[PDB]
Amino acid sequence: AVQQNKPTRSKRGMRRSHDALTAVTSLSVDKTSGEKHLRHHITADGYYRGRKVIA
Amino acid sequence: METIAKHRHARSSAQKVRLVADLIRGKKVSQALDILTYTNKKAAVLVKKVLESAIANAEHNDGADIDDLKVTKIFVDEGPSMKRIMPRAKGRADRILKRTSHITVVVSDR
Amino acid sequence: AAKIRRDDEVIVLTGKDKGKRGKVKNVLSSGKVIVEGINLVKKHQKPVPALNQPGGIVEKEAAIQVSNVAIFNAATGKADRVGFRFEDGKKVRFFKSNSETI
RNA sequence: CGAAGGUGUGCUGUGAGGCAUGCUGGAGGUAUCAGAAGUGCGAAUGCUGACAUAAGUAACGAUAAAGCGGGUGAAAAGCCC
RNA sequence: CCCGGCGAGGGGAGUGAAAAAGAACCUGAAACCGUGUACGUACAAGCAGUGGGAGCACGCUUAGGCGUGUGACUGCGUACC
């Protein structure tokens, strides 16, 4: 099955009106090192909730 | 004062790069870097490199201050396409397009 | 034969160096000459570790069209034209303003 | 002291059209009256090149199968031990 | 000289009459794809225009008008070969 008429750029945009991405609302700050990280994740230096976990 | 940076002939589709470009339009540079660091897309790496280059140009060639800069313009345009061949069943051949784009970032202190 | 030869004194007829004087250094096959102190250009030279040569911006001479220079006549202080004739058994050049051998 | 060509504005004839000028371009153009034609395109499932739509959709080629530690590197599910 | 992987790509300085003449290099049309500004659009039914016509934004102004853009609401109206 295939189309009988060619769709328009207006219709293309209307369909694409649901494709926008979402950004992270905010980041968290560790209590000993001051780094920024994703909530419930460890930091790039190896801290979580004030304690060094990974050397 | 305004400062430009560009990446020409980048290996990606403009439709795919515009999704990431729409996230940082009109933001402060620090906020924009924080937004780009936590987006799980391939276009984010390219856009981040271009933004960093623009900040460096503004510091070195114009004597600007980092804490006053904002992303005043950003856009993506289509480049040339490469043409390739892919075989199908019963001896029929198809065409493949490999698309590219140009990326422009403008930072300003006003 | 040729009217302009190496080691001659010439005056420039056209260009940005119009009116200057100099000496011919060498003659190229395409119809061009190199004259000392005339038609200078600036070149951006890349360095090369071999040959112990560094880079920099250098000033050198560039070739100029042969028909844009003339032969200088010190007796008159003016440009001139050149002709050919046989004198003893040999060919010679001569000035056309006063019919004097060069 | 700015030709052809490109792109806007104003005026003008019943029409095919004409004239003037701003920006771009960087060396050619041609009155009047006569003369000769490869002389005017939207269609021919016309011919050649470029670019759209369907769509960021189908698919990534045998259902023998992978897990972990170290190394290198800007980056390692796939490279080396 | 500077950002970047001793990258691809870019921003300055310098050459030249000119670098949107930078090697993907005279001029640079159209299809097609974007960023910004003004006005319209979420109780409304069809070849998408034509006649009538408020409201908003903007430029002259002889303060009397007019020009340009958009166009709620309403009569008529089923492409071309």
Swiss-Prot record, chain A:
State the Gene Ontology BP annotations.
cytoplasmic translation; response to radiation; response to reactive oxygen species; ribosomal large subunit assembly
Q: InterPro entries under this entry?
A: Ribosomal_bL32 (IPR002677), Ribosomal_bL32_bact (IPR044957), Ribosomal_zn-bd (IPR011332)
Q: Which SUPFAM superfamilies match?
A: Zn-binding ribosomal proteins
Show the segment(s) annotated as Disordered: 1-37
Ordered alphabetically, the record's keywords are: Ribonucleoprotein, Ribosomal protein
Q: Which residues form a coiled coil?
A: none
Q: Does the keyword Ribonucleoprotein apply?
A: yes
Cite the GO molecular-function annotations of the record.
Answer: structural constituent of ribosome
Name the GO cellular-component terms.
Answer: cytoplasm; cytosol; cytosolic large ribosomal subunit
Claim: NADP is one of the keywords in the record: no
- One Pfam entry for this protein is Ribosomal_L32p
Query: Which family, according to the similarity comment?
Result: Belongs to the bacterial ribosomal protein bL32 family.
In terms of HAMAP family, this protein maps to: Ribosomal_bL32
Subunit-structure text: Part of the 50S ribosomal subunit. Contacts L17.
Record's protein name = Large ribosomal subunit protein bL32
UniProtKB/Swiss-Prot annotation, chain B:
A biological process (GO) annotation for this entry?
response to antibiotic
Q: Does the keyword rRNA-binding apply?
A: yes
Keywords attached to this Swiss-Prot or TrEMBL record, sorted alphabetically, are: Antibiotic resistance, Ribonucleoprotein, Ribosomal protein, RNA-binding, rRNA-binding
Q: Which SUPFAM superfamilies match?
A: Ribosomal protein L22
Q: Which GO terms describe its cellular component?
A: cytoplasm; cytosol; cytosolic large ribosomal subunit; large ribosomal subunit
Q: Which terms does the record give in the GO molecular function aspect? A: large ribosomal subunit rRNA binding; structural constituent of ribosome
- Gene3D superfamilies in UniProt: Ribosomal protein L22/L17
Among the Pfam families in the record, one is: Ribosomal_L22
The entry's L-tryptophan-binding residues are 90
Keyword RNA-binding carried by entry: yes
Alphabetized HAMAP family for the sequence: Ribosomal_uL22_B (MF_01331_B)
Task: Give the family from UniProt.
Answer: Belongs to the universal ribosomal protein uL22 family.
Please describe what this protein does. This protein binds specifically to 23S rRNA; its binding is stimulated by other ribosomal proteins, e.g. uL4, bL17, and bL20. It is important during the early stages of 50S assembly. It makes multiple contacts with different domains of the 23S rRNA in the assembled 50S subunit and ribosome.
- Subunit note: Part of the 50S ribosomal subunit. In TnaC-stalled ribosomes forms part of the binding pocket for L-Trp with the leader peptide and uL4.
What remark does the entry add? The wild-type allele (erythromycin sensitive) is dominant over the resistant allele, and is also dominant over the temperature-sensitive allele at both low and high temperatures.
NCBIfam families noted in UniProt: rplV_bact (TIGR01044)
Q: What is this protein called?
A: Large ribosomal subunit protein uL22
From Swiss-Prot, chain C:
GO CC annotation terms, alphabetical: cytoplasm; cytosol; cytosolic large ribosomal subunit
**Which Gene Ontology BP terms does the record give?**
cytoplasmic translation; ribosomal large subunit assembly; translation
Source domain of life: Bacteria
Supply the alphabetized keyword list.
Ribonucleoprotein, Ribosomal protein, RNA-binding, rRNA-binding
The answer to whether UniProt assigns keyword Ribosomal protein to this entry is yes
One of the record's GO molecular function terms: structural constituent of ribosome
Gene3D superfamilies, alphabetically?
2.30.30.30
Q: Which Pfam families match?
A: KOW, ribosomal_L24
UniProt key word RNA-binding: yes
Q: Which HAMAP family match?
A: Ribosomal_uL24_B
Q: What's the subunit arrangement here?
A: Part of the 50S ribosomal subunit. Might contact the SecYEG translocation complex when it is docked with the ribosome.
Main role?
A: One of two assembly initiator proteins, it binds directly to the 5'-end of the 23S rRNA, where it nucleates assembly of the 50S subunit. It is not thought to be involved in the functions of the mature 50S subunit in vitro. One of the proteins that surrounds the polypeptide exit tunnel on the outside of the subunit.
Return the similarity comment.
Answer: Belongs to the universal ribosomal protein uL24 family.
Indicate what this protein is called per its UniProt record: Large ribosomal subunit protein uL24
Provenance organism = Escherichia coli (strain K12)
Q: Which gene name does the record give?
A: rplX
